[PDB]
């Protein structure tokens, strides 16, 4: 790790984020603008995703 | 943990396992279905 190495030799920070669920309970979510529950009328649901 | 020294050999026996050992293969609820 020479201080003046070429960019092809300089430290990167390659980190991998892996994620693939099938039916496990959710524990991570994004912006999450989750609203209130609605009733027997036809509604577009997002629930768990 | 001390070395126990009162074992009596008696080589183990075998038992015919019956219809046991089935868990819930997946996490999805079902009803009145036969799933392979
Ligand atoms: C009796 O206890 C010793 C204590 O570890 C077990 O380990 C044996 O003796 C020394 C440990 O200082 C090792 O160098 C030997 O290789 C160990 N022997 C074996 C067969 O692993 C020892 O195993 C115990 N005796 C038993 C369980 O019969």
Swiss-Prot record, chain B:
Changing residue 5 to I: In strain: Omicron/BQ.1.1, Omicron/XBB.1.5, Omicron/EG.5.1. This is Spike protein S1. Attaches the virion to the cell membrane by interacting with host receptor, initiating the infection. The major receptor is host ACE2. When S2/S2' has been cleaved, binding to the receptor triggers direct fusion at the cell membrane. When S2/S2' has not been cleaved, binding to the receptor results in internalization of the virus by endocytosis using host TFRC and GRM2 and leading to fusion of the virion membrane with the host endosomal membrane. Alternatively, may use NRP1/NRP2 and integrin as entry receptors. Changing residue 12 to S: In strain: Gamma/P.1. The gene is S. It comes from Severe acute respiratory syndrome coronavirus 2. Glycans are attached at residue 3. Binds to host ACE2. RBD also interacts with the N-linked glycan on 'Asn-90' of ACE2. Cleavage of S generates a polybasic C-terminal sequence on S1 that binds to host Neuropilin-1 (NRP1) and Neuropilin-2 (NRP2) receptors. Interacts with host integrin alpha-5/beta-1 (ITGA5:ITGB1) and with ACE2 in complex with integrin alpha-5/beta-1 (ITGA5:ITGB1). May interact via cytoplasmic c-terminus with M protein. May interact (via N-terminus) with host bilirubin and biliverdin, thereby preventing antibody binding to the SARS-CoV-2 spike NTD via an allosteric mechanism. It comes from the Viruses.
